[PDB]
Amino acid sequence: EWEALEKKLAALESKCQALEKKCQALEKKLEALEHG
Amino acid sequence: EWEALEKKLAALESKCQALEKKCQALEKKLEALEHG
Amino acid sequence: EWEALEKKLAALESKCQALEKKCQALEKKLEALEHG
Ligand SMILES: [Cl-]
Ligand SMILES: [Cl-]
Ligand SMILES: [Cl-]
Ligand SMILES: [Pb+2]
Ligand SMILES: [Pb+2]
Ligand SMILES: [Zn+2]
Ligand SMILES: [Zn+2]
Ligand SMILES: [Zn+2]
Description:
Strand content of chain A: under 5%
Oligomer: homotrimer
Largest interface: A-B, 13 and 14 residues
Keywords: Three-stranded Coiled Coil, 3SCC, Trigonal Pyramidal Lead Complexes, de Novo Protein, Desinged Protein, Heavy Metal Sites in Protein, biosynthetic protein
Chains A, B, C: Pb(II)2-(GRAND CoilSerL16CL23C)3
Order of helices and strands of chain A: H
Helix content of chain A: over 70%
Number of domains of chain A: 1
Entry title: Crystal Structure of a de Novo Three-stranded Coiled Coil Peptide Containing Trigonal Pyrmidal Pb(II) complexes in the dual Tris-thiolate Site
PDB class: biosynthetic protein
Bound molecules: chloride ion, lead (II) ion, zinc ion
Assembly: trimeric
């Protein structure tokens, strides 16, 4: 329903933000290997 | 419209879930290099 | 509100598309290390 859609969108926004940070952490490790 | 928004949100949820799994696969490869 | 939800969903769709491309760029670098 409407309220369930609002909550689903907020949960997806937060899941994507968390994935963006996980990828930034992966990138830091990859850059340490690339420049090692 | 409403129905199109519902479907767009479900498609985005699935795209993000697929990206999370792709990143986990990248992380496994990176960890093999980090610990090689 | 409704219009704010529509815009939030479009902004999230674009953020995810940008993250997918960033991960593809990370994967290219990782594959160069894996096959180096
Ligand atoms: Cl670390
Ligand atoms: Cl593998
Ligand atoms: Cl490059
Ligand atoms: Pb990633
Ligand atoms: Pb996402
Ligand atoms: Zn680099
Ligand atoms: Zn490690
Ligand atoms: Zn490879």
